[PDB]
């Protein structure tokens, strides 16, 4: 029952839909899209122990987007990863789904609203530590320009938060907030200042640093924008109010873009799994699981100056224009070099035009939050990262390569 989909548009459904589905099924449904294509997935019917997993890439390799069980259709997904997969599992117990997908083409400023106001961020992507006991201030009401109250926690303290799962690794460049006027009392509420916490997986968190305290609203009605000092790469966002007028109430928008919106900046398959485990290698290990080196996907990281290396075989010659480096799940690399090959035998370092020597790249400052490091494009099938300086705990790293088809 496993099938790959490549046509511009098509349908995906449980075997025998709409008849009741057979027992003891494990089906894999993979959509593959060419570079600079977005995959749009919409669910029409959903009725199911038993589950449907959606994967940002290859199942059990790429990150899990979500797991679904009941009678609620999964919210619409737009992926620019080049691959989006479903796994459908049933057992003997009493017993599906129908979906459709589309493949569409995708001054560019990285300042696009990510979808709080529009609803492109679905209700199921929004959550919070708590909500006000009358039920009129749910997390789902935290949408900019929303006409029905906003999010309010059950208690007003600086421990409460509103959480948004963007589902995919995204560039975050700005945050807008409003307070809200109660439709029941006409009392005004707003956040005066807040902190930002981010994460690639929803477990490992980093408080954004200058802790950066963002100045927020001074009334219940006007949008206040705070632009970040530099773009963050992340999936999960938490807004943590620190001070407020009368009480915590929040409506929100997030701004940014996708990694792939930059020229020749496609993730070449470490995170997703299109770069298979056999294409991944290293100077030394803790003997190994090649998947442990994958950006974000890995639940640990590669553990082995200027002697150790991690190596990625892209499969065919491509234009390489950068890497995404991540720490390990606590250690991380602070400084590194990069080399590349077209045959896997001979190597050349990425030069620094300024100093006319092999370039010494800045690594991470946290174990989870990744960093993009770009460089002048070169032709390469193989890439190596050489850690130079690192956290006191030692070398720990996850990686992705950025580029496009050669031209």
């Amino acid at each position, epitope marked *: 029952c496993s099938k790959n989909f490549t046509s511009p548009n098509g349908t995906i459904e449980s075997p025998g*839909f*709409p*008849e*009741k589905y057979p027992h003891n099924l494990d089906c894999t449904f993979t959509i593959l899209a060419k570079p600079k294509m977005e995959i749009i997935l*919409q*669910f*029409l*019917i*959903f*009725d199911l122990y038993d589950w449907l997993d959606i994967w940002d890439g290859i199942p059990h390799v790429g990150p899990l987007i979500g797991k679904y069980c009941g*009678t*609620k*259709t*999964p*919210s*619409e997904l737009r992926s620019s990863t080049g691959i989006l997969s479903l796994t459908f599992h049933t057992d003997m117990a009493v017993a599906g789904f*129908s979906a459709r997908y589309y493949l569409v083409h995708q001054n560019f400023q990285c300042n696009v609203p990510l*979808g709080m*106001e*529009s*609803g*492109r961020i*679905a*209700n199921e992507q929004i959550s919070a530590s708590s909500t006000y006991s009358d039920g009129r201030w749910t997390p*789902q*009401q935290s*949408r900019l*320009h*929303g*006409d*029905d109250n906003g999010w309010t926690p059950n208690l007003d303290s600086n421990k409460e938060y509103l959480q948004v799962d963007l589902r995919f690794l995204t560039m975050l460049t700005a945050i807008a907030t409003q307070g809200a006027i109660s439709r029941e009392t006409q009392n005004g509420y707003y956040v005066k200042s807040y902190k930002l916490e981010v994460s690639t997986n929803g477990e490992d968190w980093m408080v954004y640093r200058h802790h950066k305290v963002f100045q927020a609203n001074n009334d219940a009605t006007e949008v206040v924008l705070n632009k970040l000092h530099a773009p963050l790469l992340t999936r999960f966002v938490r807004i943590r109010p620190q001070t407020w007028h009368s009480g915590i109430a929040l409506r929100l928008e997030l701004f940014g873009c996708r990694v792939t919106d930059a020229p020749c900046s496609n993730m070449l398959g470490m995170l997703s799994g299109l770069i298979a485990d056999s294409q991944i290698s290293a100077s030394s290990t803790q003997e190994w699981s090649p998947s442990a080196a994958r950006l974000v996907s890995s639940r640990s990281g590669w553990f082995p100056p200027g002697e150790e290396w991690l190596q990625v075989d892209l499969g065919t010659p491509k234009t390489v224009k950068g890497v995404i480096i991540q720490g390990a799940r606590r250690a991380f690399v602070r400084k590194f070099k990069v080399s590349y090959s077209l045959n896997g035998k001979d190597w050349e370092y990425i030069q620094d035009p300024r100093t006319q020597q092999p370039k010494l790249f800045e690594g991470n400052m946290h174990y989870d939050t990744p960093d993009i490091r770009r460089f002048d494009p070169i032709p390469a099938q193989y890439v190596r990262v050489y850690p130079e300086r690192w956290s006191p705990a030692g070398i720990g790293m996850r990686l992705e390569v950025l580029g496009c088809d050669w031209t």
Partner: antibody
Amino acid sequence: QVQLKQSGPGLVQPSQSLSITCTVSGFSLTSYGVHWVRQSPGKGLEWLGLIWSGGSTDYSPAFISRLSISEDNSKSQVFFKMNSLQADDTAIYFCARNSYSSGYYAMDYWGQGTSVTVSS
Amino acid sequence: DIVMTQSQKFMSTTVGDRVSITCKASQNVGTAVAWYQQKPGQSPKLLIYSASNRYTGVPDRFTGSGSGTDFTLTISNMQSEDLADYFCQQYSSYPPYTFGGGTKLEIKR
């Protein structure tokens, strides 16, 4: 209380367009999608199209060439616009709530209907 | 397109009696079926969703049944206020929301 309040014209000249606004209250358009349906003696009840939470649309194949559904979340308004009406588009037009934000679900709350006559 | 056939245009009944309204889909639609009640000069009202689930607030005397192609709406004890046109519809596959032609009830008194 959940309400869908329709506003639109009673008379449309042949080959002109029909605009109807569906103003919703008691729920958010980011929580529930909205359908458009019409009812006539000759053709019964016909689905025209929908908009989901997030703004993605689906149209009946008979109407896709001349129908637009869009919305304004901040105003709780869904905009229906159909072009080039003719005599056989005479009907009562309805908006109706989708029982969920996405998916094909049952229409659980209905607007009051807008009677539209296509005539010179 | 899927066709939803209600062969009963009109049905005679009596206060207190059982009414069984049938609807036949031209292809299999699973349980993706709803029933609506429409009284004169009013908008339709949802009674039943997913073939057999009673919508919240709908009186107990309304029950839906069936799966695949054959669907039934049962009113277990007809009341005068149940005079209406009753419509089935499918939303299993595209184009969705094809409606039956309606079944109007008449009460003998």
